[PDB]
Amino acid sequence: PFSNSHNLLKMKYSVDDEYPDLSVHNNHMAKVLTLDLYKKLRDRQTSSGFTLDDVIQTGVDNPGHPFIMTVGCVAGDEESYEVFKELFDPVIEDRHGGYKPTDEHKTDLNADNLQGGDDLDPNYVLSSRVRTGRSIRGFCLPPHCSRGERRAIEKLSVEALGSLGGDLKGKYYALRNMTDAEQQQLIDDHFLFDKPVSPLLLASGMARDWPDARGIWHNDNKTFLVWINEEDHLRVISMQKGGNMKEVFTRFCTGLTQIETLFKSKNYEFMWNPHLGYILTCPSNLGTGLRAGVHIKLPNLGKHEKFGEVLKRLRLQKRGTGGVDTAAVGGVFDVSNADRLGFSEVELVQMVVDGVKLLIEMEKRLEKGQSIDDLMPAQK
Amino acid sequence: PFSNSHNLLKMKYSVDDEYPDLSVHNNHMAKVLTLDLYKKLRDRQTSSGFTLDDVIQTGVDNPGHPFIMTVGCVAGDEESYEVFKELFDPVIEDRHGGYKPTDEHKTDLNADNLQGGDDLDPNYVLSSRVRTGRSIRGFCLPPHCSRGERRAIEKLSVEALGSLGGDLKGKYYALRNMTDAEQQQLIDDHFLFDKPVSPLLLASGMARDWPDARGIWHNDNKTFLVWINEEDHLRVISMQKGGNMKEVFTRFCTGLTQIETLFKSKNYEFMWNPHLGYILTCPSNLGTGLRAGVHIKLPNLGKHEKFGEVLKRLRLQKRGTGGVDTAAVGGVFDVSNADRLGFSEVELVQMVVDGVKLLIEMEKRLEKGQSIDDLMPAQK
């Protein structure tokens, strides 16, 4: 990243002179990078000038921990995954549960294929959401994109979003000219994003020129949200209070379809291929880039010795909730699908719907002091 | 290859597509950059690939505060100051009090030319120090330097330093394998440096690969210190408890002279020219790159209405450092010269010696309830 991407004097130094010191590192890149791989790939560049050193810098700078391995590398453009496939393919295989170079990724954004999920118990599920990321083909990704590229992405995106109507009619809020009131309102809405503070992001060069060409779009109904030029070109989020995951996913799918159609009318499309699905900056987000989740009240499961194992069997994961600061919130979890690549969007939301229903059944048993042993699911 | 393909991508965008949005910025770079200048210069690159976008990136990312001015640009190699002179010359002129493109900077590292300064009252001066930075010619500067360059600098520096003897015999401590006890003791001495946290530095890319090829060298007396590969290739520091600034500067001068001679024996030299003096990453540090200062107890003068004006007249600056349990926050200041370029090293240390002597005289008056108006210095 930064100027060093194109420090021409690297050519006079050897593989041994330039190879990073990854001796205290615990990230996927560092697990894969070898002296021979560095030798083979250090003289290659994508058409936009992205290099191996650019790919790996964040994992050089951020050793990571063993508790939850970080990827340690980024793509700078679409070509990155091809030009540096000898590094990315094993990283992807390790990060995505054995996903091999020969495997196929199926996309499925036909919400009609989702079964049920219109009725997650709202006594437990406070809110439902489905998010993903997209990249616009022909532009570099945020670690590498120029101010010019970023501005072009914002202009195309704003124009497409300004063409949505009906339930998806909305408004754009550029970060650069945001008023205080507007900022506080987006904060109230849980729609604002800030300059990144993660050293994993910052080390990749993605936060350059902040806040130039960054913005927030949302529909008037505040159920469809788009972030422009943050971690990826687009982040798209559908949400609703309550338990109707089916309606949230239906909106998600028709909004992405409508947006894509509008881009296509201007000769733009998303980065996608049948191996990696949708292309994004971080290898962890490939395939679907989809996180479908619920904010759910599970105070008894939360304390249960088997909760982590149940989530794993269901291919789900948890985090706490977070929007703005205030005070502790007892037994409420953000539960979402764990997988991203090698499962379609429909399959992922199906796993959340089916899994959350079982979690609620278990929570109800625990409320009564009943065992949940018989409800332990088989591994999915 | 090793080409600067991304700059060619940017040249396919228009000048105004790529021109940074500096409408809220308070830094020297932003005061000078114009669309026309950007047009003329944006197609250039140094022999290491460094571009105008590379020079200005930190100043785009850090608009600064409307009060204190930041420089907002960096050099990436020696050539940067010439290849982008149309940007750096006006920045330098504004930052350094009218220093013109035609002016000459004189170096003077003959400690015998300092008059007095051997006994600043140690009842007041707790410690005295003289610091500078140096770059080694033939290597890129920290924003840009590759791992290989950085390692080469480390190696050549350690070799030179290992040849110092007598009062300057010392030892090198690389950050990557500093034992905890070692680092606690370097903490104990105020000798350690950490990964930078300044957004001005981080936005320039200088913190890449931390802590690879960074380290500290110091003699056994804990009076001569060299930091390697931090903000500049070398930062050289001479320090003593007490007020014998003359001793401190004498050691500083012969240390620099001895290190330079040893580098020359291996056909390396410091980056220098007769207009900018010693070349360093930040334009604020050119000429001498020198900061001579004392940690001094001035409880009375600290709280006087005129303190600020006295320091200004003396061309000094303060910062509020703290003492052990006896001094602590307690009227203790770090007082140093404000000038860097167009003044020699001897001339700067002389201003510190003479100005601290007068400050102590004023404090002694104030301790007795006496007036200090007749001690007000004329403007230097």
Sequence of strands across the biggest β-sheet of chain A: 2-3-4-5-1-8-10-9
User: What oligomeric state best describes the polypeptide chains here?
Assistant: homodimer
CATH superfamily of the largest domain in chain A: Glutamine synthetase/guanido kinase, catalytic domain
Sketch the topology of chain A as an H/E string, one letter per element.
HHHHHHEHEHHEEEHEEEHHEEH
Q: What count of domains describes the coordinates of chain A? A: 2
Helical percentage of chain A:
25-40%
Termini Cα gap of chain A: 40 Å
CATH topology of the largest domain in chain A: Creatine Kinase, Chain A, domain 2
| H/I helix tally of chain A | 13
Describe, in plain words, how this protein is organized in 3D.
The structure is a homodimer of 380-residue chains. In chain A, 33% of the residues lie in helices and 14% in strands. Chain A has 380 residues and is of the alpha+beta class. Chain A has two domains: 5-101, ATP:guanido phosphotransferase, N-terminal domain (Transferase Creatine Kinase, Chain A, domain 1, Orthogonal Bundle); 104-380, Creatine Kinase, Chain A, domain 2, CATH 3.30.590.10. In chain A, the strands form two sheets. Chain A has an eight-stranded antiparallel beta sheet. A two-stranded antiparallel sheet of chain A has the order 6-7. In chain A, a hairpin with a 4-residue loop joins β3 and β4 (224-228). At the A-B interface, α4 and α7 of A face α1, α5 and α8 of B. Chains A, B: One of its GO terms (biological process) is phosphocreatine biosynthetic process. Chains A, B: It is an enzyme of class 2 (transferase). Chains A, B: GO terms for molecular function: ATP binding; creatine kinase activity.
